[PDB]
Amino acid sequence: PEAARAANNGALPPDLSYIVRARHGGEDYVFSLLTGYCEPPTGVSLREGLYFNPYFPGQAIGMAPPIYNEVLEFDDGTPATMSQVAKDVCTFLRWAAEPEHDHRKRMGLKMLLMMGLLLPLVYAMKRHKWSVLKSRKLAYRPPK
Amino acid sequence: ELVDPLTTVREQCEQLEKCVKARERLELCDERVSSRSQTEEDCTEELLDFLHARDHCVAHKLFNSLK
Amino acid sequence: SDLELHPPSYPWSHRGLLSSLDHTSIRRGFQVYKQVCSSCHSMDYVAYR
Amino acid sequence: VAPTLTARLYSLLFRRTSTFALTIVVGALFFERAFDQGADAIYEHINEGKLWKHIKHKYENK
Amino acid sequence: AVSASSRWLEGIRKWYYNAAGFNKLGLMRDDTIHENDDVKEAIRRLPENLYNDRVFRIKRALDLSMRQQILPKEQWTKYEEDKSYLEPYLKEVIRERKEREEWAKK
Amino acid sequence: MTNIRKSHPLMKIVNNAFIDLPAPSNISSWWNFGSLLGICLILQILTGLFLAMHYTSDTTTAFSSVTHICRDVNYGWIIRYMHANGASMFFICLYMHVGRGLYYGSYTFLETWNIGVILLLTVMATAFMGYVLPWGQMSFWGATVITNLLSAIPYIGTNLVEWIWGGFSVDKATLTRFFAFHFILPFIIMAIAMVHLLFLHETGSNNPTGISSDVDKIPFHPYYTIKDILGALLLILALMLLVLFAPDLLGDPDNYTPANPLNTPPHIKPEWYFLFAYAILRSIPNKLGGVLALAFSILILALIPLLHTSKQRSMMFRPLSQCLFWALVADLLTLTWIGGQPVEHPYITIGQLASVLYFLLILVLMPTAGTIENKLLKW
Amino acid sequence: MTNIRKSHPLMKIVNNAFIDLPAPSNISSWWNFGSLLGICLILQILTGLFLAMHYTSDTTTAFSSVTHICRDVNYGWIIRYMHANGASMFFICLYMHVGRGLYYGSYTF
Amino acid sequence: GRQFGHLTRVRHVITYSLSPFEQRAFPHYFSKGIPNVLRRTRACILRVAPPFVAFYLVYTWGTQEFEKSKRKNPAAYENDR
Amino acid sequence: SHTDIKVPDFSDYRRPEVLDSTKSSKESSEARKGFSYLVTATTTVGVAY
Ligand code: HEC
Ligand code: HEM
Ligand code: HEM
Ligand code: HEM
Ligand code: FES
Numbered sequence A: 001p002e003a004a005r006a007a008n009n010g011a012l013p014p015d016l017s018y019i020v021r022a023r024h025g026g027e028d029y030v031f032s033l034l035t036g037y038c039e040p041p042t043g044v045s046l047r048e049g050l051y052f053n054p055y056f057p058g059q060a061i062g063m064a065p066p067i068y069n070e071v072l073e074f075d076d077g078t079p080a081t082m083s084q085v086a087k088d089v090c091t092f093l094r095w096a097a098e099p100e101h102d103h104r105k106r107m108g109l110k111m112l113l114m115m116g117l118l119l120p121l122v123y124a125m126k127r128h129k130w131s132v133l134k135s136r137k138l139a140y141r142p143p144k
Numbered sequence B: 001e002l003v004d005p006l007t008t009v010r011e012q013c014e015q016l017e018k019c020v021k022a023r024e025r026l027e028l029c030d031e032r033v034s035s036r037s038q039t040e041e042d043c044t045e046e047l048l049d050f051l052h053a054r055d056h057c058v059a060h061k062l063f064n065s066l067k
Numbered sequence C: 001s002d003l004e005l006h007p008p009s010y011p012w013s014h015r016g017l018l019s020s021l022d023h024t025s026i027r028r029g030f031q032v033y034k035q036v037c038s039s040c041h042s043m044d045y046v047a048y049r
Numbered sequence D: 001v002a003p004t005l006t007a008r009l010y011s012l013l014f015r016r017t018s019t020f021a022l023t024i025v026v027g028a029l030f031f032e033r034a035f036d037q038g039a040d041a042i043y044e045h046i047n048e049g050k051l052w053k054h055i056k057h058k059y060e061n062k
Numbered sequence E: 001a002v003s004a005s006s007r008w009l010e011g012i013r014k015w016y017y018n019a020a021g022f023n024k025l026g027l028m029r030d031d032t033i034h035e036n037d038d039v040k041e042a043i044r045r046l047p048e049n050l051y052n053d054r055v056f057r058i059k060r061a062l063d064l065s066m067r068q069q070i071l072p073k074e075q076w077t078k079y080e081e082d083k084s085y086l087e088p089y090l091k092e093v094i095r096e097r098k099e100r101e102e103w104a105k106k
Numbered sequence F: 001m002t003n004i005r006k007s008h009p010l011m012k013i014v015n016n017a018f019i020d021l022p023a024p025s026n027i028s029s030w031w032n033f034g035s036l037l038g039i040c041l042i043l044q045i046l047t048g049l050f051l052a053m054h055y056t057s058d059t060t061t062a063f064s065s066v067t068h069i070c071r072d073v074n075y076g077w078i079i080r081y082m083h084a085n086g087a088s089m090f091f092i093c094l095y096m097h098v099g100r101g102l103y104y105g106s107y108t109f110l111e112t113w114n115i116g117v118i119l120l121l122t123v124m125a126t127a128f129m130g131y132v133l134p135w136g137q138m139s140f141w142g143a144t145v146i147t148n149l150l151s152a153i154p155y156i157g158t159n160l161v162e163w164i165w166g167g168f169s170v171d172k173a174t175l176t177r178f179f180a181f182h183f184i185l186p187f188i189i190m191a192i193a194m195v196h197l198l199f200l201h202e203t204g205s206n207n208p209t210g211i212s213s214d215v216d217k218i219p220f221h222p223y224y225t226i227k228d229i230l231g232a233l234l235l236i237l238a239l240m241l242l243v244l245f246a247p248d249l250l251g252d253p254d255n256y257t258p259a260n261p262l263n264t265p266p267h268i269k270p271e272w273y274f275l276f277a278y279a280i281l282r283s284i285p286n287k288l289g290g291v292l293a294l295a296f297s298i299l300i301l302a303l304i305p306l307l308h309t310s311k312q313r314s315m316m317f318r319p320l321s322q323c324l325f326w327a328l329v330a331d332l333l334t335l336t337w338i339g340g341q342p343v344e345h346p347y348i349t350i351g352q353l354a355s356v357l358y359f360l361l362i363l364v365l366m367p368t369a370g371t372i373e374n375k376l377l378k379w
Numbered sequence G: 001m002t003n004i005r006k007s008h009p010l011m012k013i014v015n016n017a018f019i020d021l022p023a024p025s026n027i028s029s030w031w032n033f034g035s036l037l038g039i040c041l042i043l044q045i046l047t048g049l050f051l052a053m054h055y056t057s058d059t060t061t062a063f064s065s066v067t068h069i070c071r072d073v074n075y076g077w078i079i080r081y082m083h084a085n086g087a088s089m090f091f092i093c094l095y096m097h098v099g100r101g102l103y104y105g106s107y108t109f
Numbered sequence H: 001g002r003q004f005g006h007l008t009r010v011r012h013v014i015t016y017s018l019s020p021f022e023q024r025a026f027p028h029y030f031s032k033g034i035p036n037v038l039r040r041t042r043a044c045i046l047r048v049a050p051p052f053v054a055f056y057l058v059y060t061w062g063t064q065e066f067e068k069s070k071r072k073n074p075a076a077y078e079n080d081r
Numbered sequence I: 001s002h003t004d005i006k007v008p009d010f011s012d013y014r015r016p017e018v019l020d021s022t023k024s025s026k027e028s029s030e031a032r033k034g035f036s037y038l039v040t041a042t043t044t045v046g047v048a049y
Helices: A002-007 A028-035 A082-097 A101-130 B005-014 B017-036 B044-065 C023-035 D005-014 D017-046 E004-019 E037-044 E048-066 E087-103 F029-052 F062-072 F076-103 F110-132 F137-152 F157-165 F173-196 F224-245 F272-283 F287-307 F319-339 F345-377 G029-052 G062-072 G076-103 H029-071 I025-048
Strands: A137-140 H013-016
Touching (some): A028 A082, A082 B005, A082 C023, A101 D017, A101 F224, A101 I025, A137 E048, B005 B017, B005 B044, B017 B044, D005 D017, D005 I025, D017 I025, E004 F345, E037 E087, E048 H013, F029 F076, F029 F224, F062 F076, F076 F110, F076 F224, F076 F319, F110 F137, F110 F173, F137 F157, F173 G029, F272 F287, F272 F345, F287 F345, F319 H029, F345 H029, G029 G076, G062 G076
């Protein structure tokens, strides 16, 4: 952590593993964050490393903006775009925070198709048994 | 080159009413600040309320326009 | 008390109920990490598995 | 007249409580074998080109 | 400090009686009461003709609440008719314990 | 009882405390929460167990290990999610199980109520401690606040706290304890439960109209056993649907970060079901007096039976006594959202207002409401 | 049973499974191992507990931790020794509790 | 003692019922039911709704009054002085 | 006296297979029950999987 912080000029880079589920707002937080870098409004000052970004809570961040148009080349070869590049990451992290993702919704579907049967069926039986009670008739025939 | 899809979609939304409408206040605040910047004042508050209304439009358009 | 803006909700290929992730884009998404995030932000919790 | 499919069925199966139990087992037996297979395609048909199952064909065995 | 509101009370009480459901199931005012030790003894002394007709209303009451339904409003009880039959017995048992409870003070 | 198999081992005659236990005829679904507590309790202990086998209690280890479950263990992700969300689906039952208590005036049973009170009071302790175990950020500080709060006691306070901590602060030995407690303690709840159910078998259940049901009774086996099963089924979805599609929704705490004593999170709250209690506290400026209210918050439930003010048990027949009761519902619901808000002046005043109202309803209005209506009906 | 306090909570009538449980007159000391199992069982669970609070289950930790008990914890050495030896004094009872079983032919139950 | 024998004394109360087979699992479920829901939805709704209504107002009102205070700093004190 | 008792009509609740007064129940009986159980045994299939 110290050798980490030292080069970062007192800043501490957080772990990115689950950082999706950590910060509020979901992944959209990240994408538009890396998206947004504005010009400082008139009448506001910053520290040198600190850069003004609206989303970040203090709006002063020691992260220099990583992305410009086409920082890389892709294994695919799709043009590298600040917008295209950014989103492609913000999908990745979403997978790291729940690697089970694509697997779980199977049951999510598959339990519903299962469950469509029971609830009426069970509800079929319930009225069947009780049907003797709701059919009652009383009469009061006193020798009186 | 590649111009990004982003910036292109940026300008169409800011061409809407409330974007430019609130953007007016920016100049209004700033130009005042331009005189009064010596005071504690900043327009950052106003800058923000601009950004929100902007991106709501930006929300739908470009994510489609991507690959 | 900094005004915290909220990210406007974008559509997402996985946003829906039964929607899944796009693996094709992920390959790119990883490639970026090895390129850029390698500098500072780490990920401890994942193997090459 | 011939007995309705139930009228047969009840006499052949659900009468003897053994069979009435047994039929249940084999029922769920075949059930899961067909049922689970359908559920995948429906899901899989929703996501096309989003899974290596399709995607892996680009790079698999080179 | 109630005069016209008193004349407004019976608009509420005599009418309030209309706003508490037990009029609508076929019950009465008396059969409702939360059971207590006195009532336990108050019950004993009721002759048949009252007693059974205390049973049957209940037995018909509960069953209806099972089926979530309510009697035809023609056959609802009418506030003008209120059978108080419990009171003339009940005041006895409350009275007669007061004596012991007091006589055993000193 | 000729060759009835129910005698022969005696233990089965003890098992005719269920099957032939006579019951009222008319029973609303609101009485299903009798069972659905139990099943939400069992389903814990198991799913509560198979977590233990891979969990480890250490300041160095613990958080790493919970990582290790969701990642590397086959079917390891469902269980952790059944357990945690299996807590919330436990309370949402539990409250209703009290609500039925008041509104039909079941508290008239005097003993069974009390054992009810304790049996609540324990759970709130358990479902707390476990919430420390993940050793995440919101667990660490959320631990200090609650405990350090107890220092308010005038003299023995300073020692008594340091005792539980086993030191000056929340470092290791404070963790290891809260594992060994959170493990054992549910069994005791299971112990009491079989007492809390006992006294009930003497007087039978109450029934919605608030009338002695004697003339009308029903076997418990063919009828209500299905209805609980039907009741038992709807839970699963409400449990599954939540735990499966939307894991983190009710998982409102957002904080997985490994606890750093130096940093502090900007906002700090317990998970949801606690909040209103924690909201009561912020009201009182005076510290010591503040704590008592929180302790006095629940205990008042024990004093309610003294306040039975009328001649008829139910609230289904008392419009007034019904009118107020619902205001109390929103009043609580208010408190919930209040505590979940920062302590700026628009909120501040509100909580102080809703606080007094809360007691005023229970402790003054409701006992008065019964008095008038006795007078109305000419009782 | 007039104002006998044994009825009033029911649970105490369940507690007349002990007090008035009738018993034979002549009983050898060999029947004391009925109780002494129980007490050797209770005395475990407690002394079995206060070990747990300082024990840790890890391949790396565990042994270090048991070291840590006998050394650094106030009164930490008695407990570990009550627990372990509280096991052996448990069996030596237990066997006898079977032995009485055969030699008087109690297994008839 | 034993539960069922001695419960209470009832006299001259006659009961009728049918096998569960002879009769149906849904005796006009929709037709006879859907009115029944309504007439018993309204009897309570007078007694239930109003308090919650009060809450929601407070909630909305509360946020707005909250919002104006914080979000706009140059509100009561504008940036002149 | 006592014989004045007479049974009310349950026709609304029945199902018409048995509706007629002049028919042998034993003709419908076979299938009539055969349906009910089919519900039960079907249910157990779900629980089983
Ligand atoms: C210049 C080195 C560096 C680069 C390269 C870098 N980061 Fe950053 N980044 C930082 C540091 C240091 C912080 C935290 C500074 C702070 O919080 O003030 C940060 C901030 C962040 C944050 C938010 C941290 C917080 O406090 O919430 C995220 C998320 C992030 N980086 C992810 C990324 C991503 C994605 C990339 C690749 C586009 C990347 N980083 C590349 C240095 C870097
Ligand atoms: C009424 C019974 C129980 C309740 C209310 C309860 C509640 C909780 C809660 C709220 C948590 C924290 C949830 C989380 O961290 O995600 C938890 C965690 C845990 N519980 Fe329980 N639990 C109960 C029973 C049990 C039982 C019987 C066991 C052990 C057999 C157990 C073992 C654990 C363990 C090891 C953890 C830590 C695992 C984790 O939190 O991820 N719990 N429990
Ligand atoms: C884990 C906690 C609890 C469990 C397992 C539990 C279980 C039960 C069960 C199974 C019944 C019988 C079914 C029923 O009468 O509804 C019951 C009855 C009752 N319980 Fe509990 N309950 C719990 C908590 C409470 C609490 C916290 C209270 C009060 C503070 C309470 C008060 C009552 C009352 C009053 C009844 C009887 C009501 C009636 O018969 O109409 N219970 N409980
Ligand atoms: C019939 C009841 C029990 C028996 C026969 C029993 C027996 C034992 C034995 C033979 C050991 C190993 C002795 C040693 O390593 O010196 C042991 C250790 C241990 N027991 Fe138990 N025990 C019982 C109950 C419990 C209970 C109820 C707990 C927890 C509450 C418990 C917790 C432990 C722990 C943590 C250890 C490891 C500590 C150590 O071995 O030094 N035991 N027990
Ligand atoms: S105790 Fe420090 S803020 Fe309340």
